[PDB]
Amino acid sequence: MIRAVFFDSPGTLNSVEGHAKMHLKIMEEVLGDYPLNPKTLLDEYNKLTREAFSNYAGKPYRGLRDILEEVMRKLAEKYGFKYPENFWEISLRMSQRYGELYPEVVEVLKSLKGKYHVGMITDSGTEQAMAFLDALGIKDLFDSITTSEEAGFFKPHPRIFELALKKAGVKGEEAVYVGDNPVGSKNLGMTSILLDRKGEKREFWDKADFIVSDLREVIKIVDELNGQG
Ligand SMILES: *CC(=O)c1ccccc1
Known about the structure:
This protein has helices at 19-31, 38-56, 64-79, 87-98, 105-112, 126-136, 148-151, 158-168, 216-225; strands spanning 4-9, 117-122, 144-147, 175-179, 191-195, 210-212. By secondary structure, it is α/β, with parallel strands linked by helices. Strands 3-2-1-4-5-6 form a 6-stranded parallel β-sheet, with helices on both faces. α6 links the parallel β2 and β3 (144-147). α1 (19-31) packs across α2 (38-56), α1 (19-31) packs antiparallel against α4 (87-98) and α2 (38-56) packs across α3 (64-79). The chain is elongated. It is classed as hydrolase. The entry lists the keywords Computationally designed enzyme, hydrolase.
């Protein structure tokens, strides 16, 4: 039976509303008075980060800060502005100010806790993951927190899922994974629930076992899988 529910963090938990304008403001802070359109810088940054994230999926862990600093070094060299030595801190300030959970998250996590193992699985480094959970006040809502840094590899490499299952003491067939962007979990027998809040991730629909738009649907799926629907 299903004894554990794992959440893809931060994707299933943290709102992305307004993030494009937040990232535009980061680029404005990088540039200052430099005569480059911040939207042009943002678009080029997003191209390079897309490339990097595609490259690193399934590969050994590398720190995000190192990756993003490399991207910014390349862009500063390309466009002629001074490399922002504090780019990471500029970005972190933005994420601290505007981090915000989706409105149903806390009650869903509390509804599952104690009845099922409630786990978090993330590609974030461990320090970043813990700081995220603490900033949003939900660290104690998880029974396990499993990172790419601990496993050694980024999703969708199976090691991170194997480690999460071992921490919980459950088999894959006893677990659900709620995912935001599953390029993985099913290699280990886990049941996959894709969270698609806007009904826009059709490239992931067909491999998912279930698709939901709101995490309150997760409870109802787990109940059904356990014969209590
Ligand atoms: C990217 C960005 O500005 C952000 C990310 C997470 C939380 C808040 C803001």
